[PDB]
Symmetry: C3
Amino acid sequence: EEVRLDKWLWAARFYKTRSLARNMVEGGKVHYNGQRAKPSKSVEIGAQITLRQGHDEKTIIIEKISDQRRGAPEAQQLYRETAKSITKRERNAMMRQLN
Amino acid sequence: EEVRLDKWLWAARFYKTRSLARNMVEGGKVHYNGQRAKPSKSVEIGAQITLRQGHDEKTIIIEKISDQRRGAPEAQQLYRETAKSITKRERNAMMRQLN
Amino acid sequence: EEVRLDKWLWAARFYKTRSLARNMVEGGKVHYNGQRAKPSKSVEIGAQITLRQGHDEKTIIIEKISDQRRGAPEAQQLYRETAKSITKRERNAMMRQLN
């Protein structure tokens, strides 16, 4: 019911290890509702996370709270990425091919 | 718990002001479950809104009912845009200047 | 509410008849959490369904459980498609007759 942001990011399979997720938050690469955050902050439903994956930026809305890391098909249910983020993500994807 | 459509649209930050939202609903530029509606209609969870935000059309599903207009990061949780609406917005968009 | 994968797929308007839906699961054309399934498997919220529609594949998450096939505006609320599935569809799309 109460889970840390680093934990949650890990449970959602955004980062491979719990350490990587906690390093990523701490290095300011993850926002929570548009701000820098602690990795021990407890996640809320309807919160906005903005995170960096490889070269992508993703903004996702927390749908659900788990402290368990599960198979890929089963982790997706915790979050939806905004339409904003998707189009924006693929537009920069494009550009790199054209470069 | 009971919120007007014009109000909801304002809270969701689709229109900047409440008054413009009611003018938009009155002018048929907003659909509620594929039909024209009154701006005083009480919103439901899981309802379909179709609206024009500029030169685009957006179809979104109400995720959450609030009567509070809040910051941009916090308004996104009220709705998700359909896969249909997204692909279609992007279809017509990159259509406009290659023209 | 206890609903078949069968009925659910039909209620969400993925396949036009209840029989076609039962046939698609039975022919292995529908995955449930990355596996082949019985069309009698009871559907759960947050489950991952991967299905063949046209020449496309779609990955969606169960948002809601209904056993009622309702109007198109009203069915969309049972499910969301992942961003991944969306980009994958349009990638294989654009790539199609651009050929």
